[PDB]
Amino acid sequence: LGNRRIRSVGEMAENQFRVGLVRVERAVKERLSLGDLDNVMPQDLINAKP
DNA sequence: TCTTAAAATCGAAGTTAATATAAACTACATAACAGACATAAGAACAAGTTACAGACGTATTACATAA
């Protein structure tokens, strides 16, 4: 049992949230690379639905 | 003749009922929807054509009455 671990609701919630965050981060990096960022707000860059 | 990667299999019922991310403008042709008209089909009324029924009228026979 020192070689097997317990993973609870907090850990897997964190894991899935991090997966969604990476999913957002890919598109955010794609958008930031364009350059035209004069009229962009932080709420116009991320994607809450993933 | 000996490794080494693939290929295939692994009990019945029973229950069970799904998800959820990520160009715009313009030009043209076609299909669909609505309205109106004509047509075909049925409903209604009235008449005509025809035979039979229902009770009457007639014809026939038998009884009664008159000579």
DSSP string for residues in A7-28:
--HHHHHHHHHHHHHHHHHHHH
What φ, ψ does residue A10 adopt, rounded to 5°? -65, -45
Q: How far is the CA of A20 from the C1' of B45 (A)?
A: 84
The A 1-50 residues near strand B by Cβ under 7 Å are: 23, 47, 49-50
Query: Which helix (H) or strand (E) segment is A32 a member of?
Result: helix A9-32
Half-sphere exposure of A27 toward its Cβ, with a 13 Å CA cutoff?
A: 11
A7 and A33 Cβ atoms separated by less than 8 Å = no
Chain B, protein-covered positions (CB within 7 A): 21-22
Q: How far is the CA of A19 from the C1' of B50 (A)?
A: 101
A34 and A21 Cβ atoms separated by less than 8 Å = no
What is the experimental resolution, given in Å to one decimal place? 2.7
Q: Which residues contact A50 (CB under 8 A, 6 or more apart)?
A: A20, A23, A24
**Nearest 5°: CA angle at A10, between A44 and A6?**
145
Q: How far is the CA of A34 from the C1' of B33 (A)?
A: 49
Best CA proximity match to A45, nearest among A20, A21, A23, A28: A28
DSSP 8-class letter at A42: G
